[PDB]
Amino acid sequence: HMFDVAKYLRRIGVEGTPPPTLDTLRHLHKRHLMAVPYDNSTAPDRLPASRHLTNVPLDLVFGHVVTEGHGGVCYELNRLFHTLLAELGYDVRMVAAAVRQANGTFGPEREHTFDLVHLDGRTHLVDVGFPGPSYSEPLYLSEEEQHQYGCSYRVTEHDGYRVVERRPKGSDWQPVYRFRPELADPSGWDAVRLVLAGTTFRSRATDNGKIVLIGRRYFTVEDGVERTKVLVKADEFQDVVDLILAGA
Template identity: 45%
Template sequence: MFDVDAYLRRLGRPGQRPRPDLDTLRTLHKQHLMTLPYNVAGQGFADGVHLVDVDEDEVFRTGVLEGLGGTCFQLNRLFFRLLSELGYEVTLLAASTAEGRENFGTEIEHMFIRAVVEGQEWLVDVGYPGPSYLEPLRVSDQVQTQYGCQYRLVGADDGAIAVQRRGRVTRWGTVYTFRPRARQWHDWKELEDRARAHHATASQDDGQGILCGRTFHNGQAVLKGRRYLVVRDGRERVRTVVDDTEHRRLVTALLTGDLDPGDLA
């Protein structure tokens, strides 16, 4: 069963419930990313793809208490509930990634959060594999720096906003685009139907269906299929993992957090 105090203990914040201020939000956001992995297989799709009618208590047990993590539909949904019960003003937002548009043809794809703290809006996202922001991103036209990476919000004529990121030596690239419009759970029903059809025909035998990510204190590591990306202090290293044994080891290490120093070099 969903339990705020158990959730906070899992995130390393036992004891008295914290105040719903910006410092708490920053701490919980980063600690959430470091504690619970992005894990497509974490909640499993053996019984079908469920994005709307989600058993939050069961997802809390497996994703948080057992540490299996999940995707945006589990992690951001649970974090939304946690922030609400702590007293934050939060709403759901929908974004679209390049991969989502290619596979599902919809802008209502990724699920994340907008929080209003002391009159300022912040983007909150603990359910993206990365690379992306490790701490909440202020809704502003200013460039923001986190752990060697820069972020900016760029508006388009159609009202959409792109969250863009660049490392120390890389160009600006779009993480995802969104419209600043509050969403409801049922807005993702169309995506759920399309994801079920896509999942039924997808093959994961060669490891290409793998997508998992883990945040550490100054960066992130992401394994997408055979492509392994590490961002550390804004410096990026990417390679293709050919060896099956190493691939399985990296999957396990990312999900458990037991990464060797060489994995993050």
């Protein structure tokens, strides 16, 4: 009952109650990724003993992300965004995906959680909860090449999966994640199941790209041009954390 559309829209820098159109969806998606960073720093603290996402009240996640201004992980940010989109009138369907790993395999089948929106006879992929380099505006569910912010995307079909692939400037196509579109479900969020500190993941979009910090590995993409640096200095590291977490 604490979920509040207006409070959320203010949190992401969106004015009024914009109309339920594709132009609005594209704006909401980009603004969310600019304003609400991905952060797994305290994700373990919000896990339920039961392993069922339903047992984590939506208001707890809303309070952490929206009221308090923090970031979150895929099943927090996309869960909130699904609810916002539904309250703004969109036909939103939850989907789970397997993420491409550094070694080229795909990880567990339902590790990543995101959404699809069916609008005006076309289906769009919606994902404001993915740590690494990926799309700032929704993709169409199509193998046709799509272009945004200096990168290309396509959603190909391979062996019963749809595969989101990305190509920045000067690089080859690489998969991001894969999913089974036919398992999309309007109510799918209800079915989700969940020493040095573990590796921290933090990122957010910028006006023309994205900034990503994975451990010490700092990545930026600006109009499709990528740069990476392994951070050594503690002060520089903290400056990058602060820049990500401050939003835009």
